[PDB]
Write a protein that binds this ligand. Structure first.
Ligand SMILES: CCCCCCCCCCCCCCCCCC(=O)OC[C@H](COP(=O)([O-])OCC(O)COP(=O)([O-])OC[C@@H](COC(=O)CCCCCCCCCCCCCCCCC)OC(=O)CCCCCCCCCCCCCCCCC)OC(=O)CCCCCCCCCCCCCCCCC
Ligand SMILES: CCCCCCCCCCCCCCCCCC(=O)OC[C@H](COP(=O)([O-])OCC(O)COP(=O)([O-])OC[C@@H](COC(=O)CCCCCCCCCCCCCCCCC)OC(=O)CCCCCCCCCCCCCCCCC)OC(=O)CCCCCCCCCCCCCCCCC
Ligand SMILES: CCCCCCCCCCCCCCCCC[C@@H](O)O[C@H](CO[C@H](O)CCCCCCCCCCCCCCC)COP(=O)(O)OCC[N+](C)(C)C
Ligand SMILES: CCCCCCCCCCCCCCCCC[C@@H](O)O[C@H](CO[C@H](O)CCCCCCCCCCCCCCC)COP(=O)(O)OCC[N+](C)(C)C
Ligand SMILES: CCCCCCCC/C=C\CCCCCCCC(=O)OC[C@H](COP(=O)(O)OCCN)OC(=O)CCCCCCC/C=C\CCCCCCCC
Ligand SMILES: CCCCCCCC/C=C\CCCCCCCC(=O)OC[C@H](COP(=O)(O)OCCN)OC(=O)CCCCCCC/C=C\CCCCCCCC
Ligand SMILES: CCCCCCCC/C=C\CCCCCCCC(=O)OC[C@H](COP(=O)(O)OCCN)OC(=O)CCCCCCC/C=C\CCCCCCCC
Ligand SMILES: CCCCCCCC/C=C\CCCCCCCC(=O)O[C@H](COC(=O)CCCCCCC/C=C/CCCCCCCC)COP(=O)(O)OCCN
Lengths: 121, 64, 53, 104, 175, 56, 329, 459, 54
């Protein structure tokens, strides 16, 4: 697809202004919960490497791990949703503007289609 | 222990590809496959030709 | 669990199929129709291709 | 508890390793006789007589009376083929060829 | 018994002979059946009457599920997935019903063979003929479809059979 | 003794709570696919006087 | 209503109660053999009644009581054929079994596992009844394999003896060779007649081809120890004498002749299979009598006599006289 | 489907927060509860499927496999309790974690509605098994065994992935429902031939197909008892399930592409069976018997008829239960004798009579004694093969005889005869072992009463 | 058991793969570490890319 050269694109914008017309991901998004789970696993591994009681060594450190992962994951999800929206928008616009490349197929019914039959013997 | 080891695990390191072993392996491992393939293929070709000519009498042959 | 599996309700619809077949056989024997028909779909709705060979 | 050198090895080519193999299988060097050095991986293993376990002495005090085996003695490559529940090679009152001719 | 339809499972009138003893010796079979009646049939009947009255104290019903007719595969577009789903389900239900029809005819045939005795070869001609017709129709409909059978494959098989029949009819007419 | 055997047997609630949460999760998924509820040609039905949806 | 069916099913059912009680307290006492013997005598007396009913009138029955499963157009159900053969063979088998159990109460008195031995005998009797009263090929196969397993277990009764285990495995091997033909016949009948039920097989086979009948003949030769597959019967004398008298003498080894008798409507329409059966029976009876003429073990003499009698039964089958073969059985 | 997945996931924290002496009890109890919950999947329809969501669906082909998978976990825990006595708490928890992760991956794999999802979980099942084999295996060959079990598998499955993505670029979907409803014939072409081979070989190598089966004896004889149980009972059936699913897009090429494999199976089942006649290791014998049964399943799937599919499903379930029981019996001998050689411990019926009864029942079930579901599957497959070609009976018949022989051979060598004189450490059987055998064998004889549950979607 | 399963089926797929991969590894990794030969090879590949892909 290569939307790097897409016209009207700001060189270093993480989320453009037009991205604000899309619904934001919910705070209970399953992907956000998975990001928080990744942060929790990072905290547990940090406890294990430093040779501390894994489950209950640093609660502030684990909370910061989870919170940072959730924050970055929320913004990443917003950007990903925006990029897929752009892809679909361009696809539909291109199909609309080139009708001779996407003709409407003349609908046919299985009663008037001759399909070959292969017996299983 | 020596008996079980010789029967199981000492086989391959003492294997040497020789005309006798090569010929016996080829025969015993390839000949049966092609023999059975020929037999079954001939049988199924005969049955298919009989079905196409319609002279097989498959009456009551409902389950396959 | 074995008792639960034994008393599983008939979602596979065996007795339903039996009743339907009974009614169909009754109707077709009553009106002289030849029980099961050789064609699954009636040919009136199939448009075969003309060969003209 | 068996050492690495106590396991079956490759076909013995020199009389010294021949004698070494014979001692490993608890037998005399004159009685030791490996399988021919063909392709199949018999290797160092000794080729014992093809007699069945049924023709061994039933009045001897074997350590394993049912198998008629002694602890430590070399086991025939095909012991599971001759276990008194399977093919035996005991001499018969009538010769094999005569029996085959008469039955056929 | 009213538990099944007598027309779907027909039976002959069941004419049985009358006892015509020829000697004065009492046969043991009659006495054995009388003692069997007294010792077995009465208590079983009483238990059944108790259970039946208990069932009559609590009467409730269940129903046969009726299915609407939907368009079949012969009027579905090439890629219209919803219509093909409905048609496939309907075709599968019809396949099950046809299997049960064949089962009913086979039961008729087996009962005839047992009932007729030594003259089953002549007295079970009708059941054999009915089974022959139903078996031929079922074989034409559903044979050789494979394990991955579907309504589309059945339609293809029917279309090929109709093409062959049309060609044969045209060849015979133009003979 | 309560508040002492809990510290050893609180573990036995994890799997049943997971089961209840899984059932609840399954119910949520069902709501999303209601696009054809009471719209199939086979089960198309008129609603009862006090019925809002045919199934849940 | 019509006590025939109730009586016929009750005989087979009450044959099974001591098997259920084999885990109760009676099994751990010394009254269990008498329990089994009394049960068998009661079953014989009960089974004497449907025989009287058939003798008076000619009562014949099919009882398809439990529906097992349905593979599309093929319905498999638990069905019993209470015909002349069943109602005549059940009393004879029960009478012989009662005599053999009374004999074993004296013969195996010093055996530590006499309860187990009696239990094994009852299990064989149950499997043989299942074989004899079956109406479809699957139930008949169940009985066919059950009697073979019981034969394996009872031949190798003294499991510390190598020869007993060898003889048991030999019996299994030969009967498996026969099982090949049994499975061939089942596959052929399912593929062509669309049934394992006997009624449909008789209806749809007015001129039976060679393949299913040859499979049936192979199974009969395997289980009745005909000349090709004969030695396992003399080898089976490793078991205790009551086992040799019950299974390998009069009741279990006539199962192949019974299978050929059950399929006699299809057998009379084939002349090649009849000739094959005739020749097999004749060579079997001659060879086994010739072998018996010089034997020194008395049990071996009687076993070879049994084999020759079975060959004579197969000769009778070959000349299209199945009821005579049943009478000889 | 999450009502089964979530508790299986909750097994992990429950295991890790458990007391040091209560891991086995809690794991066994909650695994049994999960099995009871999964029993509800058996209520299937004659119609399409139980399509829970866009991601997971259940069928009467998937339901018995799921029930077997959930039932095998408590048995594996019971079997592993013994030989893991002297192991540290953390490593025991890691072992239980590996078993739970394997169960989770299998559960998801059977119910996945997408071919790519199925591939990912089908490969994810490899890592726990490899760790179990190469970490808690006993002999030094385990490392080599693990390597084989890995690379064979991967050598088959890397082409499949390629084919899969190729298919999704042509049809536009890999969802199984759409794939079934939009199926199109495969024309006879070299490209189509290689696509067929790519779609088939990954499932062939895991059955395993004869000639590609060299990894299985190594892996099964070198694995710990739980690893052997899960490998023989469930992991072999993944190839059968995959071939049953994927053959819908391979027609009518299968009509002639199946010939090399069919032969390789029909002859192969003979060879492996004969191999069982001359074997000095119990586990090796049981593994080769597994190869023979799976060759029969391969024939059933390649024949592609309703009776073939019913027989293949029934045989898969029956073989899983039977092979797991046989491996457990062999291990209960090994933990007493520490040898794994058939002719060392002899005449065990005299010393352990109830275990001898368990041996007899397991041998009878492996021998396919009617009316066991083993024989039901075998007979349905044999009838379908006879319809395919009447000559097949010969090979099939031969296999039957041979099978009985080696089965009874294994029963006679270990249980009958005279006891070995110098072996004086054979203790009475524990309640745990007897309960393990009972929990293996009772479901089989119960299932013979309702065979429709294990006959698949074509019943 | 011996000829097919333990020898030839082992010879065909796994052992041949191991032998070929090990020989190729020895071929590739057995380099003396002299920049002489490395840069001569670099010159050869530069000429090949110049005179083969255009
Ligand atoms: C689809 C997947 C779904 C599941 C996801 C799976 C992954 C999730 C977790 C990922 C990682 C995060 C946590 C791991 C950190 C490592 C720490 C550790 O080692 O454990 C020690 C610690 C216990 O030990 P300790 O007494 O504290 O101190 C001991 C020392 O730590 C050290 O002890 P030691 O030194 O004495 O012992 C040494 C030992 C220690 O070695 C280790 O244990 C290291 C751990 C392995 C490396 C981790 C890899 C990183 C993540 C990759 C995961 C791969 C998954 C992909 C699938 C492939 C499967 C391999 O090493 C050895 O013995 C060497 C032998 C090696 C054996 C074979 C190696 C296999 C490793 C593969 C493991 C993969 C699964 C691990 C599951 C969790 C394990 C704890 O474990 C824990 O208790 C914590 C586990 C998680 C806590 C859960 C508590 C939450 C419960 C609250 C309520 C329930 C929540 C639900 C909410 C709703 C309720 C209302
Ligand atoms: C036959 C009718 C029975 C009716 C009564 C109820 C029977 C209950 C059976 C329960 C299921 C089998 C249980 C197996 C585990 C045993 C646990 C145990 O250790 O017990 C020790 C207990 C105490 O003894 P002990 O003093 O500790 O023993 C010391 C030593 O261990 C010495 O021990 P041992 O030497 O006493 O060894 C035990 C004994 C017995 O142990 C076993 O062999 C058990 C397994 C036998 C079958 C193997 C699989 C074959 C395929 C079966 C598929 C159908 C399953 C049906 C549904 C089953 C549901 C669970 O060994 C044998 O006698 C060899 C059995 C060979 C049977 C061959 C024929 C099989 C097919 C028969 C036809 C069935 C369908 C007929 C259809 C047509 C007519 C309706 O003794 C017993 O409980 C023995 C029970 C008697 C054997 C029952 C055999 C018939 C039942 C077969 C399955 C159920 C059929 C239901 C329909 C019947 C009509
Ligand atoms: C030991 C000494 C003897 C003591 C015992 C004496 C008593 C003997 C009785 C034992 C067996 C004798 C046979 C009697 C059969 C009667 C019961 C039978 O009829 O019920 C069957 C029912 O059996 C069950 O369906 C099968 C058992 C379920 C098996 C599931 C296993 C449980 C989970 C374990 C884990 C799974 C592992 C394997 C995964 C695949 C079939 O019933 P069905 O005619 O049809 O319909 C039931 C009634 N309806 C019509 C209302 C519906
Ligand atoms: C090792 C343990 C077992 C592993 C598993 C083995 C299973 C894999 C076997 C592969 C199945 C067969 C592959 C191709 C079958 C197609 C049929 C074709 O080969 O037969 C003839 C083809 O003729 C010749 O075979 C041409 C090819 C000859 C070269 C192929 C090599 C032959 C042997 C190689 C075996 C090596 C296998 C192991 C690789 C490492 C038909 O003639 P033709 O009508 O014209 O072609 C029809 C196909 N069309 C329509 C696409 C054109
Ligand atoms: C077909 C069978 C093909 C050959 C099968 C080979 C099987 C080999 C593995 C068996 C295991 C070894 C074994 O069983 O031991 C041999 C064991 C011991 O011998 P005994 O004399 O009892 O010694 C006891 C006193 N010391 O003997 C046996 O049981 C082996 C029996 C093998 C029988 C093979 C011959 C069968 C030929 C069949 C021809 C007839 C065809 C049908 C004719 C009927 C016409 C419709
Ligand atoms: C015993 C003491 C208790 C006495 C109270 C009960 C008295 C009788 C009342 C019973 C009520 C009737 C009843 O049992 O229910 C019917 C019910 C069948 O259910 P259906 O759905 O109608 O048909 C099956 C297909 N679904 O019948 C039964 O289950 C009981 C009778 C079963 C027969 C005995 C089975 C024994 C053999 C076990 C199976 C062996 C393997 C199968 C071999 C197949 C051979 C081809
Ligand atoms: C074109 C390139 C194709 C690449 C194919 C990759 C095959 C994957 C396995 C590659 C392994 C090769 C390396 C190797 O095996 O070395 C020989 C090695 C020497 O032992 P080391 O551990 O290295 O040293 C110990 C002494 N210090 O010998 C072994 O251990 C062999 C054991 C591993 C083999 C296991 C089975 C692998 C082959 C199975 C068949 C699959 C082949 C895949 C390609 C086939 C074509 C489709
Ligand atoms: C246990 C070890 C087994 C190892 C795996 C064996 C299976 C090998 C299967 C072939 C490998 C590649 C599969 C290709 C993936 C499918 C995609 C596809 O089918 O597309 C084909 C492409 O097909 C190919 O290109 C395949 C060419 C083969 C190249 C790789 C060779 C690998 C070895 C081949 C021989 C061995 C195969 C059987 C091995 C048996 C087991 C040992 C069409 O391409 P297009 O150009 O887009 O369409 C044509 C119209 N323009």
């Amino acid at each position: 697809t290569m939307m790097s050269g897409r016209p009207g694109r700001v060189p270093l914008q993480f989320l453009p202004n037009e991205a604000r017309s899309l619904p934001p991901p919910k705070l209970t998004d399953p992907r956000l919960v998975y990001m928080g789970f990744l942060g929790y696993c990072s905290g547990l591994i940090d406890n294990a490497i430093r040779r501390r009681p894994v489950v209950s060594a640093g609660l502030h450190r684990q909370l910061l791990y989870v919170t940072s992962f959730v924050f970055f994951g929320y913004y990443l999800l917003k950007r990903q949703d925006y990029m897929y929206a752009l892809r679909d928008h361009d696809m539909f616009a291109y199909v609309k503007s080139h009708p001779e490349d996407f003709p409407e197929k003349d609908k046919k019914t299985y009663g008037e289609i001759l399909e070959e039959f292969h017996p299983v013997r | 222990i020596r008996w079980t080891y010789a029967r199981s695990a000492n086989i391959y390191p003492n294997f040497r590809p020789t005309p006798k072993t090569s010929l016996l392996g080829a025969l015993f491992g390839i000949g049966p496959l092609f023999f059975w393939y020929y037999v079954f293929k001939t049988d199924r070709d005969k049955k298919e030709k009989l079905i196409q000519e319609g002279k097989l009498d498959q009456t009551f042959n409902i389950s396959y | 669990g074995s008792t639960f599996v034994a008393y599983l309700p008939d979602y596979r619809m065996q007795e339903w199929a039996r009743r339907e077949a009974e009614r169909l056989v009754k109707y077709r024997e009553a009106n002289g129709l030849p029980l099961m028909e050789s064609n699954c779909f009636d040919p009136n709705k199939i448009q075969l291709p003309e060969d003209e060979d | 508890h068996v050492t690495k050198d106590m396991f079956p090895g490759p076909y013995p080519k020199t009389p010294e390793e021949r004698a070494a193999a014979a001692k490993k299988y608890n037998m005399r060097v004159e009685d030791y006789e490996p399988y021919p050095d063909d392709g199949m991986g018999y290797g160092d293993y000794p080729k014992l007589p093809d007699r069945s376990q049924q023709e061994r002495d039933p009045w001897y005090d074997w350590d394993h009376p049912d198998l008629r085996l002694n602890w430590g003695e070399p086991i025939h490559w095909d012991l599971d083929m001759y276990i008194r529940n399977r093919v035996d090679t005991s001499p018969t009152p009538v010769s094999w060829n005569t029996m085959c001719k008469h039955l056929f | 018994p009213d538990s099944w339809d007598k027309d779907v499972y027909p039976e002959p009138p069941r004419r049985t002979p009358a006892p015509a003893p020829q000697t004065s010796l009492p046969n043991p079979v009659t006495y054995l059946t009388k003692i069997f009646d007294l010792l077995v049939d009465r208590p079983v009947t009483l238990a059944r009457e108790f259970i039946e009255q208990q069932h009559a104290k609590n009467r409730y019903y269940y129903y046969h599920r009726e299915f609407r007719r939907v368009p079949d595969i012969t009027e579905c577009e090439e890629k219209d997935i919803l219509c093909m789903f409905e048609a496939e389900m309907q075709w599968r239900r019809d396949y099950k019903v046809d299997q049960e029809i064949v089962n009913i005819i086979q039961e008729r045939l087996k009962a005839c063979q047992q009932r007729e005795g030594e003259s089953y070869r002549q007295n079970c001609a009708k059941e054999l003929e009915q089974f022959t017709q139903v078996s031929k129709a079922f074989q034409d409909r559903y044979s050789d479809l494979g394990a991955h059978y579907s309504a589309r494959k059945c339609l293809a098989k029917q279309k090929q059979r109709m093409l062959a029949e049309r060609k044969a009819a045209k060849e015979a007419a133009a003979a | 003794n309560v508040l002492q055997i809990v510290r050893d047997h609180w573990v036995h609630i994890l799997v049943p709570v997971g089961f209840v949460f899984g059932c609840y999760l399954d119910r949520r998924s069902d709501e999303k696919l209601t696009a054809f509820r009471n719209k199939s040609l086979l089960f198309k039905r008129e609603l009862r006087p006090n019925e809002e949806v045919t199934w849940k | 209503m019509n006590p025939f069916a109730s009586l016929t099913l009750t005989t087979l059912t009450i044959l099974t109660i001591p098997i259920m009680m084999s885990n109760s307290n009676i099994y751990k006492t010394n009254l269990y053999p008498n329990y089994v013997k009394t049960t068998v005598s009661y079953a014989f007396t009960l089974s004497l009644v449907p025989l009287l009913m058939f003798m008076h009138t000619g009562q014949e029955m099919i009882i398809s009581n439990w529906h097992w499963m349905t593979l599309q157009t093929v319905e498999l159900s638990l069905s019993f054929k209470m015909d002349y053969f069943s109602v005549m063979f059940i009393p004879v088998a029960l009478f012989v079994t009662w005599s053999i159990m009374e004999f074993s109460m004296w013969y195996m008195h010093s055996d530590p596992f006499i309860n187990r031995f009696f239990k094994y005998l009852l299990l064989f009797l149950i499997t043989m009844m299942i074989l004899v009263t079956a109406n479809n090929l699957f139930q008949l196969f169940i009985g066919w394999e059950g009697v073979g397993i019981m034969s394996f277990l009872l031949i190798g009764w003294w499991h510390g003896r190598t020869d007993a285990n060898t003889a048991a495995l030999q019996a299994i091997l030969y009967n498996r060779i026969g099982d090949i033909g049994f499975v061939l016949s089942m596959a052929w009948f399912l593929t062509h007649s669309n049934a394992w039920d006997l009624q449909q097989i008789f209806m749809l086979n007015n001129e039976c081809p060679n393949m299913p009948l040859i499979g049936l003949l192979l199974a009969a030769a395997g289980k009745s120890a005909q000349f090709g597959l004969h030695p396992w019967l003399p080898s089976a004398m490793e078991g205790p004498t009551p086992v040799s008298a019950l299974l390998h003498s009069s009741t279990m080894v006539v199962a192949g002749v019974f299978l050929l008798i059950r399929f006699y409507p299809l057998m009379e329409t084939n002349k090649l299979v009849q000739t094959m059966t005739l020749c097999l029976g004749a060579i079997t009876t001659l060879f086994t009598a010739l072998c018996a003429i010089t034997q020194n073990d008395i049990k071996k003499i009687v076993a070879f006599s049994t084999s020759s009698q079975l060959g004579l039964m197969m000769v009778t089958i070959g000349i299209n006289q199945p009821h005579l073969a049943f009478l000889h059985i | 489907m999450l009502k089964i997945i979530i508790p299986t996931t909750m097994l992990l924290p429950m295991t890790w927060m458990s007391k040091h002496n209560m891991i086995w009890i809690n794991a066994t109890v909650h695994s049994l509860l999960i099995s009871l919950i999964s029993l509800s999947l058996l209520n299937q329809l004659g119609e399409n499927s139980l399509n829970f969501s866009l991601t997971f669906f259940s069928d009467s082909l998937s339901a018995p496999l799921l029930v077997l998978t959930t039932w095998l976990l408590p048995l594996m825990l019971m079997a592993s309790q013994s030989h893991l006595s002297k192991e540290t708490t953390t490593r025991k928890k890691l072992y239980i974690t590996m078993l739970i992760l394997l169960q989770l991956f299998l559960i998801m794999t059977f119910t996945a509605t997408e071919l790519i999802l199925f591939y990912i979980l089908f490969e994810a099942t490899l890592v726990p098994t490899l760790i179990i084999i190469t970490r808690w295996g006993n002999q030094t060959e385990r490392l080599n065994a693990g390597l084989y079990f890995l690379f064979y598998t991967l050598a088959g499955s890397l082409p499949l992935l390629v084919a899969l993505v190729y298919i999704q670029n042509t049809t536009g979907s890999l969802n199984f429902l759409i794939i079934h409803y939009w199926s199109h014939p495969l024309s006879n072409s070299w490209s189509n031939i290689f696509m067929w081979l790519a779609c088939i070989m990954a499932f062939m190598v895991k059955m395993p197909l004869y000639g590609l089966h060299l990894w299985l004896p190594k892996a099964h004889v070198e694995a710990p008892i739980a690893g052997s149980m899960v490998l023989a009972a469930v992991l072999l059936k993944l190839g059968g399930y995959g071939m049953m699913r994927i053959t819908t897009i391979l027609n009518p090429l299968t009509n002639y592409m199946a010939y090399p494999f069919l032969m390789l199976s029909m002859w192969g089942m003979i060879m492996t069976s004969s191999i069982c006649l001359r074997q000095t290791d119990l586990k090796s014998l049981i593994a080769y018997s597994s190869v023979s049964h799976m060759a029969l399943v391969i024939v059933a799937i390649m024949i592609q008829t309703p009776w073939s599919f019913m027989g293949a499903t029934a045989l898969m379930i029956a073989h899983g239960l039977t092979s797991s029981m046989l491996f457990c019996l062999a291990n209960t001998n090994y933990e007493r004798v520490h040898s794994r050689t058939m002719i060392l411990a002899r005449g065990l019926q005299t010393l352990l009579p109830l275990m001898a009864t368990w041996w007899l029942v397991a041998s009878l079930t492996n021998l396919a004694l009617p009316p066991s579901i083993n024989l039901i599957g075998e007979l349905f497959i044999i009838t379908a093969s006879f319809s395919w070609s009447n000559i097949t009976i010969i090979l099939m018949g031969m296999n039957m005889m041979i099978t009985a022989l080696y089965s009874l051979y294994m029963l006679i060598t270990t249980q009958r005869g005279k006891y070995t004189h110098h072996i004086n450490n054979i203790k009475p059987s524990f309640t745990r072992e007897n309960a393990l055998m009972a929990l293996h064998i009772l479901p089989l004889l119960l299932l013979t009463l309702n065979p429709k549950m294990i006959l698949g979607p074509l019943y | 058991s011996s000829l097919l399963d333990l020898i030839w089926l082992e010879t065909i797929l796994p052992k041949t793969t191991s032998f070929i991969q090990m020989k190729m590894s020895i071929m590739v990794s057995n380099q003396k570490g002299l920049i002489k030969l490395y840069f001569l090879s670099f010159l050869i590949t530069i000429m090949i890319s110049m005179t083969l892909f255009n």
